[PDB]
Homo-oligomer: A and B are copies of this chain.
Amino acid sequence: MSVIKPEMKMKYFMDGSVNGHEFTVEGEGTGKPYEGKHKITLDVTKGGPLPFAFDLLSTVFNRCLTKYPDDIPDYFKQCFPGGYSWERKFEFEDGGLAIAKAEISLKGNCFEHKSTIEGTFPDSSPIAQNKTLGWEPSTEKMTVRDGSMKGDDAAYLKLVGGGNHKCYFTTTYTAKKKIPNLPQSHFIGHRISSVVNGTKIGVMEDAIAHLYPFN
């Protein structure tokens, strides 16, 4: 935990394929790990402009960036020194499916985030048609299973016309060194936003762990 500081920097590299379209995205960011806030700037360097919704990738671009209250142990910040990895399965309501993997390491004051994602979607999918309008704020259920954290989120995309599109996130987050203070089950409230301008993309996330309303 001590190597996780109040202000940190981040670098990102992603390789992926969606419906056969290969792409590469890279960038950097800054954030406040203990406040649960960070911002990122990215560039699509291969396969741009992306022909599918960036919302599919935004949550792939680090649970160390979460505000944790004193009464809930912070598994993620305890992952350093050591590093950790995570894998998220995305199950969309129309049958769309994607799996993303990330490895997060630390050198100095910089988190190095390397990820990959593979996805397949029907042609009618609002992800395939690049027509989703962001994720609604969400609540991820956190549990512990064999020394790993498991996260379950019923995520929803906003659509043109006011409707929504469900995507289940099923994630396993795993330290590379045994975590000594495992938390009780809890929730993480999220609010992520992203903006795409051509091949330049911005992302920001606020995340707070809690046990509201019963604490």
Contacts and interface: CB of A to CB of B under 8 A. Distances in A.
What's the number of copies of this chain in the assembled complex? 2
Given A145-B163, A154-B154, A210 B208 contact: no
B136 A185 contact: yes
A106 B156 CA distance: 33
Interface in A168-215: 168, 185, 187, 189, 191, 206, 208, 210-214
B185 A156 contact: yes
Contact of A152 (B143, B144, B166, B213): B166
A136 B212 CA distance: 13
A189 B214 contact: yes
A166 B185 CA distance: 12
Contact of A141 (B138, B144, B208, B211): B138
A132 interface: no
Which secondary structure characterizes the binding site on chain A? Answer: strand
Interface in A122-148: 136-139, 141, 143-145
A137 B154 CA distance: 16
Nearest to A141: B154
A32 to B, nearest CB: 15
Contacts of A210: 212-213
Given A152-B154, A164-B145, A166-B152, A137 B206 contact: no
A141 B135 CA distance: 13
A86 to B, nearest CB: 16
Contacts of A168: 152, 168
12 contacts: A136-B185, A141-B154, A141-B156, A143-B156, A152-B154, A153-B154, A154-B154, A156-B185, A189-B212, A191-B214, A210-B212, A212-B213
Interface of A: 136-139, 141, 143-145, 150, 152-154, 156, 163-164, 166, 168, 185, 187, 189, 191, 206, 208, 210-214
